[PDB]
Amino acid sequence: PAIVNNSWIEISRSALDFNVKKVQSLLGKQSSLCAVLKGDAYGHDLSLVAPIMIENNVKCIGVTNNQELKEVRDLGFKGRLMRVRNATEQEMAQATNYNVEELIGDLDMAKRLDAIAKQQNKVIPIHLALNSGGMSRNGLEVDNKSGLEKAKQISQLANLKVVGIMSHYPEEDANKVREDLARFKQQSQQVLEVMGLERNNVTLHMANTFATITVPESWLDMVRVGGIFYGDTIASTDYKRVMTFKSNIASINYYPKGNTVGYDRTYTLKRDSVLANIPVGYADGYRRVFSNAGHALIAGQRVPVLGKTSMNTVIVDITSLNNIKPGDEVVFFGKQGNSEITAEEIEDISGALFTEMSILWGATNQRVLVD
Amino acid sequence: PAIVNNSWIEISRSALDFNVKKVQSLLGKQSSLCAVLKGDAYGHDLSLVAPIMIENNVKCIGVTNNQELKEVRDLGFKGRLMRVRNATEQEMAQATNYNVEELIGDLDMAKRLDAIAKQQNKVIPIHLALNSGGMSRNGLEVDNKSGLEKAKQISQLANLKVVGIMSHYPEEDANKVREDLARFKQQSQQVLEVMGLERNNVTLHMANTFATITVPESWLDMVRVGGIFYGDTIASTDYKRVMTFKSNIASINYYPKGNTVGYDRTYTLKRDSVLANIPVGYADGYRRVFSNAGHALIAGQRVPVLGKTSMNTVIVDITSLNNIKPGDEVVFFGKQGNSEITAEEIEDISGALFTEMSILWGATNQRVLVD
């Protein structure tokens, strides 16, 4: 007996499959695809999304946590499995269990990983992260002779193998991309030289979703793409959205003009009203940011959230609809009839990119594969 | 082999136990305690918190979702189990499996629940929610003769039993509490009268954490308290915080003056710098709201988050510390040495109450029972 969900997120298998096939088609036999499925596949559920990558013969996947790395192996993925962030010794020592290529951007961390590999009688594959793009996040600054000297020392560690060299773009702007690209191509060249590595045995990779779509020169040996799979990109509208966030009406309540709604009485009814009580609140990631601001879809029509969101309940005004029934389907993101809640309005209310919302919705609501 | 966590939330068993015992001591033999453990025990993990209630002989618990209701029964709770929101037919029909007292504030929903009880050959217990407090959320308006008539009709439904009558305060202000209290005491009286119910067979309850601490006259037959268990209340500082949110340093990176940090290069280094890369980001609920705003604790000292949070990584400035090592413990909420990150600064950065943060952190990071 499946437990009944207060709310749920539909994950369109056909949309994902479409998107995977489309990127694959765009690259062709150029470069190669690394599917970046961090953040629990950006809220879409690593359990749901990874098998779909595996069925499309994707050969490389990037995640961040040991849990994710374990899960991806458990789902039968056999190929190249990368961690797309710097990780701790504790993390990396356990993660040899899953044959992961780690991301190293500092010599001390390279020495510490090399000590772990010596301790386990292994040679551990790494991607050397450079700060060519300028993130000053995961990557080694190799702006000069002494940064290059650090890279040379990393190449002398007998129990690492450098299988890749990478950077990452700070700004989704085609021209800033082209600049950082030229800088990476120049720096990675010197790095290969000081490290004694053959360009043909080392995967060069810099591009993310925006670069992959916008700046074909970026593709290099491999692209690292994420948001592309969920139509989440400022660079195209041809990749399909994958999530639809739904619930149902728990009660339909009649209240007089003059009544107020919600904590601190922040919305006053201007008319006798009919209010839908929906069991979604901020514990479902429907945050306080939506208070007197959000909209939902009911009967194919956009209706407003009234007052402050509660932890587990939101109230929407249905006074202008009719023939609405308890149990009627409500949509908080996605399509219903000829209405839609868009990513863009979610960003504007929330004050942050949509990917943060999809991740936080995905963490707080059951995902169900559809289509 | 336990999977290594990128980050984790310590849940102090001793703090919770302290808080439970303290409320219990405050009420004594007056009223009674309903522990409200919705929102996954406000982010503290229903799996961890419920057994602690059960060991303290708590006799009544309130949650919201069927999953939670199932879990609380599965953990061996035998007592009075309430749903503290309006719920759908789908939800309520399944939830007889767990012997739940539902929350009904409309006659149609009362009729629909009564139809479900007739369909299952049961008499289903309910709490009749009134809108005395003014939420216009879960509760019946019984301001007059015709609202009272709806309550009379609810009392004529042969397959519900009214075991309780309740309201809820919109405003944590002692005087507004006292007002709403007088209104509830007056309305619930008429309601008992029109419904043919004996006051002695029906639990009256209105108080939440703030009312329970601030306005002793509120306690009535039962209090419904939540945030009290986690020291989460504007009404006292004597209840202990329960959560500590931790991670560790993944890499320590040296970068020149003039370098920038993070997406869109929003922070420029003013000096040669030493930066700690920590594997916590917005996928761990460390939202973009913390960009160039947050602080962490390292070596017992408060240090700033630099640039925009990434999905899985935050960078903090450690240039002013020394002898810092990879794997060193980092604290994002709670105490370390003689430094602290407080609930109040989390609210100010986030723009919302702390409970939303604790819930969203709890949804995106492993909880580990300590003490």
Numbering used by the authors:
A (entry chain A), B (entry chain A): 37 to 407
List sentences from the manuscript.
In addition to Alrs, a PLP-dependent racemase is found to possess a broad amino-acid specificity (broad specificity amino acid racemase, Bar, E.C. 5.1.1.10). Notably, Lyr is also active against arginine, whereas Bar racemizes arginine, lysine, methionine, serine, cysteine, leucine, and histidine, a useful feature for biotechnological applications. To further develop lyr- or bar-based marker genes with desired properties, we determined the three-dimensional structures of P. putida DSM84 Bar and P. mirabilis Lyr, which are the first structures for lysine-preferred racemases. All structures contain PLP, which confirms their PLP-dependent nature, and the positions of their catalytic lysines and tyrosines are similar to those in Alr structures.
Expression and biochemical characterization of recombinant Lyr has shown that its preferred substrate is lysine. One Lyr molecule is found in the asymmetric unit. With the exception of those for the first 36 residues, the positions of all main-chain and side-chain atoms are well defined. Two Lyr molecules associate to form a dimer related by a two-fold crystallographic axis. The tertiary structures of the Lyr and Bar protomers are similar (RMSD = 0.89 Å for Cα positions). The apo Lyr structure has also been established within the internal aldimine linkage.
